[PDB]
RNA sequence: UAUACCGCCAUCUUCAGCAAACCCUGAUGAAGGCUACAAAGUAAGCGCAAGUACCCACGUAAAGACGUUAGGUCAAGGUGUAGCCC
């Protein structure tokens, strides 16, 4: 019956079953989800199965300066139009079947190490095209509500940095993963540290710190060493602009503490110039590749002290057993110094 | 909860027209009727045939102008005349509109045996009353 | 842009670094005035802690 | 070609003098003493970070060192004048309700702004949403009282630092000056002390604005001929 | 691998610019195959050509 | 097959809460955000409310969100999946 036919919106809403009891409390799987297909896309007004040519609708109104009359495409001509229409549909459908190659992060199904692009521009013609964002963690946290029970939320950790010392991180929370990505990305830009890089490739000195229950021990390294540290640290280092460094993470491997601990240490590192001014003495760099040549890297801007720093016979410094154990060749590990891809 | 003809709140991004934004308990308070005839007056006849004609006309016009209608039809009946007032979009070429007006007016006059007129009002885009 | 980490350094240290890195396109109006006539103490956030054991305040009674 | 000369003769010139606005004459250690600026709270209310500025305790009443107040006040008034000379927006913040009327008048008289009322959350860190996308925030915030009405630091002290806005502040013996850029140790309770602060900051702002008009006028008259 | 995916890259002792990409500019050591991903066959041809 | 759904409804509701977008607090954890002699919240929208119907400003109707019970209905009709076609 013609009077029992509904519209496309009503037909697709029922057939898709997007709003139902099976999509509330994780009651249905995601594999059998079907997609809406607009069936009016390739349809032309006036085109039918009989192939009539209506002047002024399907075909032009006037041809050769004369009003066209009603005509009908020949059988063989209509077959071509029908065959072409099938081909056009297959091509359009083919486009949707094609999978775009997505650059994977740390793992195929992991969000860590994926770029979110540049932060969104501000409302007053502000732009952050130099900054790059990379996800660090995506977690499905839950709370309990009286009405619905389990309420799923997304906690996202992202880090932003232009690669020239300015880098920050923020946490974004939202029901939708897109809203979480946006909030964290835009908020991280307003919380930017500045990291002092020695010769714009490494840290000034070895940093050992403990943030809560996370131990991070970073070592200064020469050029060409590369980033031999925890993967999350590698991502943050590329955003900061550090090219060569080694770091060992111990204790709890909490991503929040690791990130907050890393930015705490790198922010507090003392530069050579800051050392010379505080000590009032020249900072002389001794390089094995340059023999005994004394390279002065920083001099005191103020007056230079004339008394030499007292040389304590035995330094009362706390040594890390792991460092001493390695220098004595007592550390055998089948996992250390393994060949790895360039970082 | 009542469901009849209620567009339900979303995230504040669903544009609704003025008719779609008002539930059935406003049909004589904030919005009017989409059809005006005498069948449903006291002591009047032929309400059933007027309804079947209204249901058909709304489907005929939806399929005859595919993707052009910007809101519901307004069906008017004065004596023998039938007047269809449609708010359409400004996407389809005018030539195609004039063809469809002459075609629908003629085809419907012979189907319901009465003079039928089609009054088109064009809008640049769908008139959004609010965002639900 | 700016940096809202009020617990890391001072407003000048943060601003100066961001201007140097190129994040801040134009230095704020007060920046030049601050540098010319800086305060005696750099305004760095520091946490107040309770005195334990033998620690006492250096304030002396006026007699 | 002309912008650089204008900026150097007007904007950079005052930054080459130690006391371009001559704020030294506005106050002396004697005048501060007569206003009871040295009277601090009892020793039991002392904040640990205010000890470097306390001269001593006279019968368990902290005495603020006016020799430091003079140097601290000199720097605060100098910074205030330079900001007013540069056409900067100065905001006076105070939650002491005994002086709310006085401070609101002092701001209106010197052509500046005052916020003596309940500070709603996000006035500074959420301004573009509260006021509008093109709203301009203050360039200087002068705290005549840095504590709120529960004897804790006024929230704007933290928020001003978040927004990288320099702050001038009168810090009594029970206040926390760690985040105030230009702290001025002094009594913030006695009307005489508060009245003196208002006169000093109102005079420095008015003087600076007038000096800006005089310098600009001279530059323009000379430019033509 | 990087060498085998492009048929126009010829590992020859005369192609000095290509060979330089597989040596550390700061230390002069030839990167081991896991570093760049070249297969053992091409790494052996590269190592010989660099020498 | 109502445990795939649209449509139309029951129920708490003889409720007042659901809230996008921001901001702040928790050392940047799940989360939390009020004090008027005020101490971090600002909040579009939806519901309540207000308006309207009936004989009033009263009362009764109507209205009553987001969600809860995979609550009711493939037998109003339409319809995804599967099955039947002498
Ligand atoms: K069925
Ligand atoms: Mg995989
Ligand atoms: Mg009901
Ligand atoms: Mg006091
Ligand atoms: Mg059910
Ligand atoms: Mg009533
Ligand atoms: Mg009722
Ligand atoms: Mg009501
Ligand atoms: Mg059931
Ligand atoms: Mg049943």
UniProtKB/Swiss-Prot annotation, chain A:
Keyword Mitochondrion (UniProt): yes
Chief site of localization: mitochondrion
Cellular component terms (Gene Ontology): mitochondrial inner membrane; mitochondrial small ribosomal subunit; mitochondrion
Residue ranges of domain S5 DRBM in the record: 131-195
An annotated Gene Ontology molecular function: RNA binding
Domain of life where this protein originates: Eukaryota
Keyword flag Metal-binding: no
Biological process terms in GO annotation: mitochondrial translation; translation
Alphabetized UniProt keyword annotations: Mitochondrion, Ribonucleoprotein, Ribosomal protein
Compartments where located: Mitochondrion
Subunit text: Component of the mitochondrial small ribosomal subunit (mt-SSU). Mature mammalian 55S mitochondrial ribosomes consist of a small (28S) and a large (39S) subunit. The 28S small subunit contains a 12S ribosomal RNA (12S mt-rRNA) and 30 different proteins. The 39S large subunit contains a 16S rRNA (16S mt-rRNA), a copy of mitochondrial valine transfer RNA (mt-tRNA(Val)), which plays an integral structural role, and 52 different proteins.
Family that this chain belongs to: Belongs to the universal ribosomal protein uS5 family.
Official protein name in the record: Small ribosomal subunit protein uS5m
Gene name, Swiss-Prot/TrEMBL: MRPS5
UniProtKB/Swiss-Prot annotation, chain B:
Cellular component, GO annotation: mitochondrial inner membrane; mitochondrial small ribosomal subunit; mitochondrion
GO terms for MF: RNA binding; structural constituent of ribosome
Residues of the full protein shown: 36 to 167 of 167
GO biological process, one term: mitochondrial translation
Cell compartments where the protein resides: Mitochondrion
Keyword presence, Ribosomal protein: yes
Organism: Homo sapiens (Human)
Keyword Ribonucleoprotein: yes
Protein name (Swiss-Prot/TrEMBL): Small ribosomal subunit protein uS3m
Record keywords: Mitochondrion, Ribonucleoprotein, Ribosomal protein, Transit peptide
Assembly and interaction partners: Component of the mitochondrial small ribosomal subunit (mt-SSU). Mature mammalian 55S mitochondrial ribosomes consist of a small (28S) and a large (39S) subunit. The 28S small subunit contains a 12S ribosomal RNA (12S mt-rRNA) and 30 different proteins. The 39S large subunit contains a 16S rRNA (16S mt-rRNA), a copy of mitochondrial valine transfer RNA (mt-tRNA(Val)), which plays an integral structural role, and 52 different proteins.
Family statement: Belongs to the universal ribosomal protein uS3 family.
Swiss-Prot record, chain D:
Listed name of the protein: Small ribosomal subunit protein uS2m
GO biological process: mitochondrial ribosome assembly; mitochondrial translation
Disease: Combined oxidative phosphorylation deficiency 36: An autosomal recessive, multisystem disease resulting from deficiencies of mitochondrial respiratory enzyme complexes and mitochondrial dysfunction. Clinical manifestations include sensorineural hearing impairment, mild developmental delay, hypoglycemia, and intellectual disability.
Keywords assigned: Disease variant, Mitochondrion, Primary mitochondrial disease, Ribonucleoprotein, Ribosomal protein
Domain of life: Eukaryota
Subcellular location(s) of the protein: Mitochondrion
GO CC annotations on file: mitochondrial inner membrane; mitochondrial matrix; mitochondrial small ribosomal subunit; mitochondrion
Organism: Homo sapiens
Function: Required for mitoribosome formation and stability, and mitochondrial translation.
Disulfide bonds: none
Subunit relationships: Component of the mitochondrial small ribosomal subunit (mt-SSU). Mature mammalian 55S mitochondrial ribosomes consist of a small (28S) and a large (39S) subunit. The 28S small subunit contains a 12S ribosomal RNA (12S mt-rRNA) and 30 different proteins. The 39S large subunit contains a 16S rRNA (16S mt-rRNA), a copy of mitochondrial valine transfer RNA (mt-tRNA(Val)), which plays an integral structural role, and 52 different proteins.
GO molecular function, one term: structural constituent of ribosome
Curated annotation (Swiss-Prot), chain E:
Localization: Mitochondrion
Coiled coil: none
Source domain of life: Eukaryota
Family: Belongs to the bacterial ribosomal protein bS18 family. Mitochondrion-specific ribosomal protein mS40 subfamily.
Subunit structure: Component of the mitochondrial small ribosomal subunit (mt-SSU). Mature mammalian 55S mitochondrial ribosomes consist of a small (28S) and a large (39S) subunit. The 28S small subunit contains a 12S ribosomal RNA (12S mt-rRNA) and 30 different proteins. The 39S large subunit contains a 16S rRNA (16S mt-rRNA), a copy of mitochondrial valine transfer RNA (mt-tRNA(Val)), which plays an integral structural role, and 52 different proteins. mS40 has a zinc binding site.
Note, other: There are 3 mitochondrial isoforms of bS18 in mammalia, localizing to 3 distinct sites in the mitoribosome. bS18m (bs18c) binds to the same site as bacterial bS18, mS40 (bS18b, this protein) binds to a novel location of the 28S small subunit, and mL66 (bS18a) binds to the 39S large subunit.
Protein name (Swiss-Prot/TrEMBL): Small ribosomal subunit protein mS40
Name of the encoding gene: MRPS18B
Part of the full-length chain shown: 105 to 155 of 258
